[PDB]
Amino acid sequence: HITLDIAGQRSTLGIRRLRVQQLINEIPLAQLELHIPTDNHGAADNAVQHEVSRFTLGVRVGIAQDNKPLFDGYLVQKKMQLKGKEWSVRLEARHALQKLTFLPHSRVFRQQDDSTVMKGLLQSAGVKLTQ
């Protein structure tokens, strides 16, 4: 089935929506959507509070579909709604190319190839170029 790993633990919750997006020149992403149950009280009413509090911004998030790796990215932008008795939370997770996108750097790159500029430029996050 579909198993959401966050920070190494398999994190038994209930996903109502999962959508993994992957394009041709863009950072691939993955939206989750969970439901935190409120109407079933007792021991599993605060034990589900412990499982959502582990969703800090920037954690290893892994999705596995039919015992194959689906997404494997870091977490950004945890939104929660809480309308009425509903209390949903929405996750997003971005690839390792998210470490490259909002910090203005400056280099020069004299006497280098087209590939040696760029494979040393993706290497700052741990992304391994294949070419």
Partner: protein
């Protein structure tokens, strides 16, 4: 160099990017007890959303259904992060008499007719081919 010391402008851009970190809205019902700088706190909830949040504005929303609903606002949308709004043209101006530089450079006080300011003077730097 935008200001005298860049401590305050470095603090200011770091603070205006923090306000984009947590942003949302709390739809309440009908009170005038709130203001855009009140810094309210969420206490009785689960471990996800508990803590003090500083407001950004209030919306009143009178209508037939829903009654009166004072919506609170948290967070600021985005920012351009310019030191000043950029002008990237070449302009021409006339030299303006003589006035010594109070900033103790050798800057030559000119006018700019793109501004309609005949009275006020603008100190400008001089570019020479050689200087040394």
């Amino acid at each position: 160099l935008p200001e005298a010391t860049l401590q305050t402008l470095s603090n200011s851009w770091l603070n205006y990017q923090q306000m984009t970190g947590v942003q949302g809205h709390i739809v309440l019902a009908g009170t005038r007890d709130f203001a855009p700088g009140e810094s309210i706190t969420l206490s009785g909830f689960g471990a996800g959303l508990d803590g003090t949040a500083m407001l950004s504005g209030v919306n009143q929303q009178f209508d037939t259904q829903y009654g009166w609903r004072s919506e609170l606002v948290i967070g600021l949308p985005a920012s351009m992060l310019e030191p000043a709004p950029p002008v990237r043209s070449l302009h021409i101006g006339t030299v303006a008499g003589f006035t010594a530089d109070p900033q103790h450079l050798d800057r030559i006080a000119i006018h700019l007719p793109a501004l309609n300011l005949p009275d006020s003077l603008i100190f400008a730097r001089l570019s020479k081919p050689w200087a040394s």
